[PDB]
Subunit: 145 residues, 3 copies
């Protein structure tokens, strides 16, 4: 998946960003079975005061997670995954759950590309990984924490 | 909803940002009945010259609005809401409507989280809010302009 | 289309951005017939270190293209389109294709606004263009490269 994480400038130190990224990745690995190295977390920092709720300008405390996944998982699984991201980003970012927004969008795996390769259907990541060239496997395997 | 609003750096003052967020938020409230505080406007600023149209580098005058909504509304209501966003942002930003792009994407409300909670289906936002806890209501209620 | 292109600050010079924007725009025009001026490429720079793969912090050499299209094209075409964006951005940015990720999302055309107007269905674009006012047609032509 690709998790776009919209935060304020300097709300997360390099260490907190790392912890939030592990937490999102670990929740996704644990609830779906997708390998660590297939999950991207992309932080988008903007100056504080660029978020408005109900038209009221906010401080640096909001977090919006926009998760981009492939189709095929149940609504039950996606709800569990959304809820664990709320809980685990709360802890990792030391941020109250009330400050956290999370949206999941889905598209066919047939129009999703990671590492220059088309993605398999969810559940089939063992295959697909095994049918990748040695260089590609080794290169993906560096992205495990 | 979350409205991602992509604009050039310094093209909007704090006050014009404030006006554009209000124009979008009031458009959403007015046409959907959703409470002001459920609508997020998130400004994404980038240096001028980062937008290209047909391969031609642009100035600072482009606005792209990516609106993320719950499924369940009619195509007619979504058209009126996109047109109202074009018109009222044009006035609040003092930018010609020919510079404005608006895209609406939808997701099932079961995979959408705001203020740490899952959204209800479009309509009965009222019985949903009333059933949040006292402190969640008090926190949400402060974000109304 | 809007192609959101997420890169690290300073990985692409002004000329490289033009090349990447041209490669994406020529590929979209190439396979769908949608005229040049109807394709936005929108670069979102962030400092290096804001991207994590499998929880591991990345250097400055990653690219994520989020392409936002209208509905109505076939899976086969969308597949060719994404493959061509991978190859042509690899060349244009001088980056190995293992570093490239591309997701396509789609929306109904009736909830997609460009140049202040609603889009037509994915094959009815010349006639849409003719029915515009000459003023709107003129503003549109100045954006072809």
């Amino acid at each position: 998946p690709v998790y776009m994480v919209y935060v304020s400038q300097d709300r997360l130190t390099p260490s907190a960003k790392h912890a939030v990224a592990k937490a999102i990745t670990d929740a996704h690995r644990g609830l779906t079975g997708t390998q660590h190295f297939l999950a991207q977390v992309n932080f988008q920092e903007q100056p504080a005061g660029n978020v408005f709720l109900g038209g009221v300008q906010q401080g640096g405390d909001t977090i919006f997670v926009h998760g981009l996944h492939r189709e095929g998982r149940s609504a039950d699984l996606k709800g569990q995954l959304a809820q664990r991201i709320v809980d685990d980003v709360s802890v990792a970012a030391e941020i109250d759950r009330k400050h956290i927004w999370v949206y999941f969008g889905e598209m066919p795996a047939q129009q999703m590309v990671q590492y220059g390769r088309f993605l398999p259907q969810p559940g089939h990541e063992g295959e697909w990984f095994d049918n990748l060239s040695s260089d590609e496997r080794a290169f993906m395997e560096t992205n495990v924490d």
